[PDB]
PDB file of C-alpha atoms in Angstrom:
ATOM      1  CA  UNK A   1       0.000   0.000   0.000  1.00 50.10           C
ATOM      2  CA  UNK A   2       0.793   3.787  -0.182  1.00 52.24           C
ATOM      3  CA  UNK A   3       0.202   4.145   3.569  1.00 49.68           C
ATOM      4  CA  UNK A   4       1.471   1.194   5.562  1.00 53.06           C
ATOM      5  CA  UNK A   5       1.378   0.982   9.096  1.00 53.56           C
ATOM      6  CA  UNK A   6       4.591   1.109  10.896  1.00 55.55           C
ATOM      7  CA  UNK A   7       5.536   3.386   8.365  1.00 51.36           C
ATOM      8  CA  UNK A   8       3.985   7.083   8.733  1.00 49.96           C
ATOM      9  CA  UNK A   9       1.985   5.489  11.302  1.00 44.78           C
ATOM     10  CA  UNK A  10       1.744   2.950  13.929  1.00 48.14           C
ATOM     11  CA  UNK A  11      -1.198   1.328  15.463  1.00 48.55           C
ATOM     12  CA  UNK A  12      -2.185   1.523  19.165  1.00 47.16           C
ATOM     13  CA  UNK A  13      -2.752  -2.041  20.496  1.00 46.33           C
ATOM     14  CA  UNK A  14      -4.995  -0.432  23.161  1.00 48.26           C
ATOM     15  CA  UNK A  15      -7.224   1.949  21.125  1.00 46.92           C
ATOM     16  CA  UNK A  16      -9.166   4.712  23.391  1.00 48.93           C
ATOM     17  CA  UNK A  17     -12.145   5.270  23.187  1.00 46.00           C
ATOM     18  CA  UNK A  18     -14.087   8.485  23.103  1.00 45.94           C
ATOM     19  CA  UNK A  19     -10.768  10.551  22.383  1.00 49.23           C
ATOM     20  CA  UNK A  20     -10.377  13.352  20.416  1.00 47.80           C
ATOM     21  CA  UNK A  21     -10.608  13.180  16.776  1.00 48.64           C
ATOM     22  CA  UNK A  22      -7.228  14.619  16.301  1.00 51.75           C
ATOM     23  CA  UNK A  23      -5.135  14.663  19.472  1.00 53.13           C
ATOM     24  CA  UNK A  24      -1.761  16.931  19.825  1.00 52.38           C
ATOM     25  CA  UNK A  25       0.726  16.672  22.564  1.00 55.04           C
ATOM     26  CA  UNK A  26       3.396  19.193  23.094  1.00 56.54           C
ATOM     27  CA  UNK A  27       5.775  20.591  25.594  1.00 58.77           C
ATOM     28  CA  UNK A  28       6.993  24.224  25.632  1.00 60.59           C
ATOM     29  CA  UNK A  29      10.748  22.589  26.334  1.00 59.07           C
ATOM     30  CA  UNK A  30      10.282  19.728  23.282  1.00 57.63           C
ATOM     31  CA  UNK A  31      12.721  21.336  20.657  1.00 58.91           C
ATOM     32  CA  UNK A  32      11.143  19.662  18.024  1.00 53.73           C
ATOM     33  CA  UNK A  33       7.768  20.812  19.108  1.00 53.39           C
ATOM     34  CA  UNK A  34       9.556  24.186  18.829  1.00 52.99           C
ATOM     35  CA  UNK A  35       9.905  23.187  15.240  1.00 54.20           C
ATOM     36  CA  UNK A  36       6.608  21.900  14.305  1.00 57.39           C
ATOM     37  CA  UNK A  37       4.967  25.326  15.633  1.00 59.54           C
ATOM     38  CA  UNK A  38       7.149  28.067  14.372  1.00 58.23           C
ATOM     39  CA  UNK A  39       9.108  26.661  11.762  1.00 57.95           C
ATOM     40  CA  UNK A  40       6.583  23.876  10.192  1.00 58.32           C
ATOM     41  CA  UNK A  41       3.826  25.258  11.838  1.00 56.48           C
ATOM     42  CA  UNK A  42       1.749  21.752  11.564  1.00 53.54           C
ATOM     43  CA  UNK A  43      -1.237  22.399  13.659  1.00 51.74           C
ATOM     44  CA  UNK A  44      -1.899  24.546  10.780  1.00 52.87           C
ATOM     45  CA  UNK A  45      -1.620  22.833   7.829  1.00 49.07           C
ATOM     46  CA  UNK A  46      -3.146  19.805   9.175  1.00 47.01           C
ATOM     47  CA  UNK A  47      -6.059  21.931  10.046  1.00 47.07           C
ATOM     48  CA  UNK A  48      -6.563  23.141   6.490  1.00 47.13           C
ATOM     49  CA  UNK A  49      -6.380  19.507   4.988  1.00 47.77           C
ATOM     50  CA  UNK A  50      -8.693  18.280   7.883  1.00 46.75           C
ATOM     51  CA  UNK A  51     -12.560  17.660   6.569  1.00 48.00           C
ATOM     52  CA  UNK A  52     -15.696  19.450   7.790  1.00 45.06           C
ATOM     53  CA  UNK A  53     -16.877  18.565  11.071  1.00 46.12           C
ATOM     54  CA  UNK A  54     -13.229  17.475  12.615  1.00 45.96           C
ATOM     55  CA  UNK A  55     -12.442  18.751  15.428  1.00 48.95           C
ATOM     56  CA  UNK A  56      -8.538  19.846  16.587  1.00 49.66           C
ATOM     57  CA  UNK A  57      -7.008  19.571  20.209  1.00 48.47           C
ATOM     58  CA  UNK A  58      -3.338  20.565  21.631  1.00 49.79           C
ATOM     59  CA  UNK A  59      -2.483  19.352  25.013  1.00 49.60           C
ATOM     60  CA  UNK A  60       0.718  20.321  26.753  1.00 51.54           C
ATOM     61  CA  UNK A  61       2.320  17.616  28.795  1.00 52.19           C
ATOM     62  CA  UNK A  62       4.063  17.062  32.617  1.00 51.52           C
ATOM     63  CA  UNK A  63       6.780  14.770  31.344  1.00 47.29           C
ATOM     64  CA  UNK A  64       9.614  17.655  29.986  1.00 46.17           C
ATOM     65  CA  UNK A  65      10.887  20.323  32.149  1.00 45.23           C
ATOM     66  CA  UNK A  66      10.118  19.129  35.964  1.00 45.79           C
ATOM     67  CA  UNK A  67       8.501  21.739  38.481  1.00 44.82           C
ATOM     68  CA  UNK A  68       8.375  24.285  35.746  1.00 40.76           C
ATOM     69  CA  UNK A  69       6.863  21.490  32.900  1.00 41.88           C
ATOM     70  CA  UNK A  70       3.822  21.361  35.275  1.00 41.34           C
ATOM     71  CA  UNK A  71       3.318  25.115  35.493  1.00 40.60           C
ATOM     72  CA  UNK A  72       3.331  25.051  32.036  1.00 41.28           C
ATOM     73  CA  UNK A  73       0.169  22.428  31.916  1.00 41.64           C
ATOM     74  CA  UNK A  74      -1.375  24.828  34.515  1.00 44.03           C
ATOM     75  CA  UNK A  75      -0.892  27.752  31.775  1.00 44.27           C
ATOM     76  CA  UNK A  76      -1.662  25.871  29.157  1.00 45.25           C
ATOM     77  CA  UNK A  77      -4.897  25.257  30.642  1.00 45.05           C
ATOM     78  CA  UNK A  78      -5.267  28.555  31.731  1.00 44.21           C
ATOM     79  CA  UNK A  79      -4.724  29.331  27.852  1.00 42.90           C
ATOM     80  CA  UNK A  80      -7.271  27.025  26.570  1.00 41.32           C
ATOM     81  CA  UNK A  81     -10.087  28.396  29.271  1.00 42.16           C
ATOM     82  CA  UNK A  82      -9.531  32.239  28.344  1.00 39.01           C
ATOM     83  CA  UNK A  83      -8.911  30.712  24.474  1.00 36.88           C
ATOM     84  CA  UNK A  84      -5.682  32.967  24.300  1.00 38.31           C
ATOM     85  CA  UNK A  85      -3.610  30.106  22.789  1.00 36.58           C
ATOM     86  CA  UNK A  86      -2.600  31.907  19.860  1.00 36.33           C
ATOM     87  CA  UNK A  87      -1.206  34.431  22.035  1.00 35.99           C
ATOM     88  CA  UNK A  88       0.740  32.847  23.985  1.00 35.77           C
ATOM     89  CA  UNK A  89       2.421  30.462  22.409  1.00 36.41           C
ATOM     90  CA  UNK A  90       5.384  31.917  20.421  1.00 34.65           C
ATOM     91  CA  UNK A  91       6.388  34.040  23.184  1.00 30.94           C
ATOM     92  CA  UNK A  92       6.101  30.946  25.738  1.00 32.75           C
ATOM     93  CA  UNK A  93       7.959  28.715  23.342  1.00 34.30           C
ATOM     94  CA  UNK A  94      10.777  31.663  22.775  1.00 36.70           C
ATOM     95  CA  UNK A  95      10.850  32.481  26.415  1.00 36.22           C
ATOM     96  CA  UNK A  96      12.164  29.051  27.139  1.00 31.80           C
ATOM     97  CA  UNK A  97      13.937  27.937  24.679  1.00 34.60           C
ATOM     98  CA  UNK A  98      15.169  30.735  22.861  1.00 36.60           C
ATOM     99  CA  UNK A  99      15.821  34.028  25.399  1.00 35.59           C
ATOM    100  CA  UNK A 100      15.276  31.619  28.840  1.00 34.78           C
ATOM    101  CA  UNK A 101      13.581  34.289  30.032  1.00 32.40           C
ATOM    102  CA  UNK A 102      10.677  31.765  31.345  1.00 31.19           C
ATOM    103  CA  UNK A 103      12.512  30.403  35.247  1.00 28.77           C
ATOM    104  CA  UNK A 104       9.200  30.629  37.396  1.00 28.94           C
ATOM    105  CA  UNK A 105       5.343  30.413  37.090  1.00 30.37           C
ATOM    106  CA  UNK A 106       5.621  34.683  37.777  1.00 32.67           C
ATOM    107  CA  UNK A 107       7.850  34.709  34.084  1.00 34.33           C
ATOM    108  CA  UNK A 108       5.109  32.665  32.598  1.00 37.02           C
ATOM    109  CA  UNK A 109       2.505  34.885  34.016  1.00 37.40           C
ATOM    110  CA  UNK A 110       4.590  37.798  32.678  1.00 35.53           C
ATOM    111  CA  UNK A 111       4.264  36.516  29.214  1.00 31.49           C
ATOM    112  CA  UNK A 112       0.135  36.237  29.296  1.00 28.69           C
ATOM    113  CA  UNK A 113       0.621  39.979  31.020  1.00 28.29           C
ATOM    114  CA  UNK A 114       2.439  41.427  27.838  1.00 30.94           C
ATOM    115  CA  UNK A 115       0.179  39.656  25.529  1.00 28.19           C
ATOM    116  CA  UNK A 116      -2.264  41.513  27.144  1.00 26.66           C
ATOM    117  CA  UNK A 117      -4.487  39.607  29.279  1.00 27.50           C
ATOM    118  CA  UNK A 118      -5.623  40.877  32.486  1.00 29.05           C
ATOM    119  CA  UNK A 119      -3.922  40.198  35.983  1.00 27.31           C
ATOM    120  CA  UNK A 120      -7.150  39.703  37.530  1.00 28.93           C
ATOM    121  CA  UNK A 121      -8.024  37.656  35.210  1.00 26.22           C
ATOM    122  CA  UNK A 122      -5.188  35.326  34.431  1.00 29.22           C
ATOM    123  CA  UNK A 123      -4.580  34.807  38.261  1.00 30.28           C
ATOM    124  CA  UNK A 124      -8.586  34.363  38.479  1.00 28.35           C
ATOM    125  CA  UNK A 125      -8.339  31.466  35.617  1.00 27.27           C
ATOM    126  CA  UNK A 126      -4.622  29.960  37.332  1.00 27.65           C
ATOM    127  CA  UNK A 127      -6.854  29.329  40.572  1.00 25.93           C
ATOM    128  CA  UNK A 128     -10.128  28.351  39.089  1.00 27.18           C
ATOM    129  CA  UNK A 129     -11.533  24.819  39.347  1.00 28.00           C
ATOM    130  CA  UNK A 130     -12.447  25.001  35.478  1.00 26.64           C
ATOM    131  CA  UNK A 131      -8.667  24.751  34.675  1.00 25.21           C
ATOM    132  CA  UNK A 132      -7.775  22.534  37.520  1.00 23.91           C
ATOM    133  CA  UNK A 133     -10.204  19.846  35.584  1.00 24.71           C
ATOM    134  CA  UNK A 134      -8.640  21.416  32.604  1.00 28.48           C
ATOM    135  CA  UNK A 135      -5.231  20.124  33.823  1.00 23.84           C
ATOM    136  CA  UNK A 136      -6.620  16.573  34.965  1.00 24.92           C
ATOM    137  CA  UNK A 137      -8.106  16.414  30.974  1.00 25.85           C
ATOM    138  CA  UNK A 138      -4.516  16.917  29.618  1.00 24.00           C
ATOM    139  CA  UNK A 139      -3.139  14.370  31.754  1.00 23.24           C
ATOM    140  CA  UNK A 140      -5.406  11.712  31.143  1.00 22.54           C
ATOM    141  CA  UNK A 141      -5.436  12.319  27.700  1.00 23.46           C
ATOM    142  CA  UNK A 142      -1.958  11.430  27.351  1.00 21.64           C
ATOM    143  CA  UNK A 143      -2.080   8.807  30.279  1.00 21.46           C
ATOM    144  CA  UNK A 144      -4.684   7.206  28.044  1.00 18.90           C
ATOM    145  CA  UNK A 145      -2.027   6.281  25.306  1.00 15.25           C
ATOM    146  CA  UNK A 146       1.130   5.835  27.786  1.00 13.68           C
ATOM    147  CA  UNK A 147       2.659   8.703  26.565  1.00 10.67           C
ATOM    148  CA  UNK A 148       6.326   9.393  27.058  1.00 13.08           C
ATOM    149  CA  UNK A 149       7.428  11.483  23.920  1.00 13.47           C
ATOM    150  CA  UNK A 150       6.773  14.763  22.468  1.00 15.90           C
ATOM    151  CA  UNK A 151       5.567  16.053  19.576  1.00 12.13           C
ATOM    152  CA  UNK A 152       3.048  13.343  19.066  1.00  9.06           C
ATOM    153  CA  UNK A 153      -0.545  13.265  17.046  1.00  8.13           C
ATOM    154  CA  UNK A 154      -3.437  10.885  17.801  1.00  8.97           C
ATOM    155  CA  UNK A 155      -5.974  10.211  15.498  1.00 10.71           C
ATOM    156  CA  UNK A 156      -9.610   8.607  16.684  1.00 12.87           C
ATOM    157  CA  UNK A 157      -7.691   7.524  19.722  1.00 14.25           C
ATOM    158  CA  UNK A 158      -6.560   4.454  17.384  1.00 16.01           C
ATOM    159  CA  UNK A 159      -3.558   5.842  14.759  1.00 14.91           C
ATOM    160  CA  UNK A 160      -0.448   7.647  16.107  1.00 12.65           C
ATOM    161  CA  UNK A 161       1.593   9.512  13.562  1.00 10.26           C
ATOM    162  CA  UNK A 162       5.343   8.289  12.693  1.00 12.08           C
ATOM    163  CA  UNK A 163       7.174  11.560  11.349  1.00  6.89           C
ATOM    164  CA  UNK A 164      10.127   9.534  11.790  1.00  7.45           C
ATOM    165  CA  UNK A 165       9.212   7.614   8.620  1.00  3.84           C
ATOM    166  CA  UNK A 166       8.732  10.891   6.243  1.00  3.29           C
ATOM    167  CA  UNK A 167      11.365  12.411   3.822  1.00  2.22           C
ATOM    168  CA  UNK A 168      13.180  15.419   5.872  1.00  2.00           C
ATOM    169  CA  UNK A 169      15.194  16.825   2.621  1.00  2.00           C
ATOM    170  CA  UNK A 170      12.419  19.180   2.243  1.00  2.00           C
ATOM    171  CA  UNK A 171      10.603  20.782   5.118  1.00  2.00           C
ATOM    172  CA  UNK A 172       7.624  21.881   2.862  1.00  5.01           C
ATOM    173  CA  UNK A 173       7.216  18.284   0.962  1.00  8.85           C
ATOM    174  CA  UNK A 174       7.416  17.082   5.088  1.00  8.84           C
ATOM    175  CA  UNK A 175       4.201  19.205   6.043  1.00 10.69           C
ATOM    176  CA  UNK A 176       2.222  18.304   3.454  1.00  9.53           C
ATOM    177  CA  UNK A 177       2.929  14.561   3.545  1.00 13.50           C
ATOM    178  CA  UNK A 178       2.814  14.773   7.570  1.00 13.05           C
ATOM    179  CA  UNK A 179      -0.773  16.735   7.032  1.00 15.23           C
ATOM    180  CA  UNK A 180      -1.729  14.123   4.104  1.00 12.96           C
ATOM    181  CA  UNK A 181      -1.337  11.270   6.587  1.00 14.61           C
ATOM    182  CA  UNK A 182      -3.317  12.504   9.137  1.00 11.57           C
ATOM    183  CA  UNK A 183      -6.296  13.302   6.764  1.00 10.79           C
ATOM    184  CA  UNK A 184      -5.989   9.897   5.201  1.00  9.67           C
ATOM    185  CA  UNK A 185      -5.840   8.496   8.198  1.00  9.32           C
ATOM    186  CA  UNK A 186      -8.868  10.836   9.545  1.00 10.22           C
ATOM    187  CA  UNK A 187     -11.177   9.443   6.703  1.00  8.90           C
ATOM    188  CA  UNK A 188      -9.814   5.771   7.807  1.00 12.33           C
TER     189      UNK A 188
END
């Protein structure tokens, strides 16, 4: 076949059920997550190959970065609730991996802060019970498929995306077939 598992894909022996249609996992210290956002910007063009009716999601996960990896979740959720995601996340992914700026939860606040959302009302969200079941949704999500590498992409909690077997020569001819996959695999 064209598409052959254990190729651009593998197969999850313990498929999940109810999950999101497509399912994103990232960390803001994953360098090749780094990539896939500002460089590739994946999310993106999978979107615009993605049918009608599909729905996207982008979790951030514990795993990367200790103490600070968890705040991130936290943020990330705080993010999601306030839907301020594409505010945030250049500036979050620069601050730590770029200008390591980002050291404490009060740097990531200061990000949210110059990208204009209110004190009140990020510290409001980073306390509120909506995100703390915000937070327990990311981790399960990626408890649900044993996850313990970033970037990843889940698709009807049954295909997981190998980017590992795609030609890198070309960055552009990468996206498309990376985006490609996922559709074919969406209409699977």
């Amino acid at each position: 076949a064209q598409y052959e598992d254990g190729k651009q894909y593998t197969t999850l022996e313990k498929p999940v059920a109810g999950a999101p249609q497509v399912l994103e996992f990232f960390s803001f210290f994953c360098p090749h997550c780094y990539q896939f956002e500002e460089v590739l910007h994946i999310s993106d063009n999978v979107k615009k190959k993605l049918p009608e009716g599909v729905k996207m999601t982008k979790y951030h996960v514990n795993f990367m970065g200790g103490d600070l990896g968890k705040d991130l979740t936290q943020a990330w959720a705080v993010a999601m609730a306030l839907g301020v995601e594409d505010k945030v996340t250049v500036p979050l992914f620069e601050g730590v991996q770029k200008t390591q700026t980002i050291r404490s939860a009060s740097d990531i606040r200061d990000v949210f802060i110059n990208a204009g959302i209110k004190g009140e009302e990020y510290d409001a969200a980073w306390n509120s019970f909506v995100v703390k079941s915000l937070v327990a949704q990311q981790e399960k999500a990626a408890a649900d498929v044993q996850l313990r590498g970033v970037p990843a992409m889940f698709v009807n909690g049954k295909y997981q995306l190998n980017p590992q077997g795609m030609d890198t020569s070309n960055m552009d001819v990468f996206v498309q077939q990376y985006a490609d996959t996922v559709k074919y695999l969406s209409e699977k």
